[PDB]
């Protein structure tokens, strides 16, 4: 029915055939992974996680979120620096999560 995935420390409840974005994890683009850090597939709850149940995840793209313009300026003190933090992401979907 769906799947809870813990990417880092961030959870995603994503249903079947939904392409969504997580933090970049150097995943292979366009390939298939048996992800284990999963929970709550379909009325299915395990105490620490979903034992003997893993999700089958395919990736579509690797990109970066738009440039976070981090600026450090102090008023009337002349401490001003600029940088761009483009946090990367992996856009992926679940296909045939196994039980």
């Amino acid at each position: 029915m769906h799947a809870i995935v813990v990417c880092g420390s961030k959870q995603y409840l994503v249903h079947e055939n939904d392409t969504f974005f997580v933090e970049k994890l150097e995943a292979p683009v366009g390939k298939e992974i048996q992800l284990d850090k999963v929970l709550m597939l379909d009325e299915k709850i395990g105490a620490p996680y979903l034992e003997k149940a893993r999700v089958v995840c395919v990736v579509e793209k690797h990109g970066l979120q738009r440039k976070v313009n981090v600026i450090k300026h102090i008023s009337q003190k002349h401490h001003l620096k600029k940088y761009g933090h483009r946090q990367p992401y992996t856009k992926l979907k679940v296909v045939r999560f196994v039980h």
Binding site: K10, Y12, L13, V14, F20, F21, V22, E23
Partner: protein, 144 residues
């Protein structure tokens, strides 16, 4: 990061509700009335939507307060000029338009919002029971 938790697509629609205050205490009724007007209990309640409901209060002349606050507490409201402070005790408002107090006291607990103006209007206080809102098919309940 984000999973885009869902909201209603301007699907807000309110319902008429009935209540009578005879053995009711101002603050005790006011908290639940505010929760009803905001739709505070609802899970889809967002501060920019306020999926509340219409509230009808029948026989506001029967509300009761405890202690000596009827003769001890006082309510101030200053007009535009000096001496415009109408300062009325509870016993004064017992023999006067206490419905206005029912309005303003709850309004005082309203969110600091441009549209709290628009939801304080959702409360219709009546010292009797005659109104065309009876023909609007209202849903009666207790401790609204």
């Amino acid at each position: 990061k984000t999973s885009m938790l869902t909201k209603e697509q301007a699907n807000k629609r309110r319902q008429w509700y009935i209540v009578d205050a005879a053995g009711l205490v101002l603050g005790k009724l006011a908290v639940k009335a505010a929760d009803l007007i905001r739709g505070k209990n609802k899970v889809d309640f967002t501060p920019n939507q306020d999926c509340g409901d219409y509230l009808i209060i029948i026989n506001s002349d029967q509300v009761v307060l405890t202690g000596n606050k009827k003769e001890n507490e006082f309510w101030y409201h200053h007009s535009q000029y000096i001496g415009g402070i109408k300062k009325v005790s509870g016993r004064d408002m017992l023999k006067k338009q206490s419905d206005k107090l029912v309005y303003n006291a709850v309004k005082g607990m309203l969110p600091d919002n441009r549209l709290s103006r628009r939801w304080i209007t959702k409360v219709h206080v009546f010292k009797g029971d005659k109104h065309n809102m009876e023909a609007q098919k209202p849903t009666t309940l207790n401790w609204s």
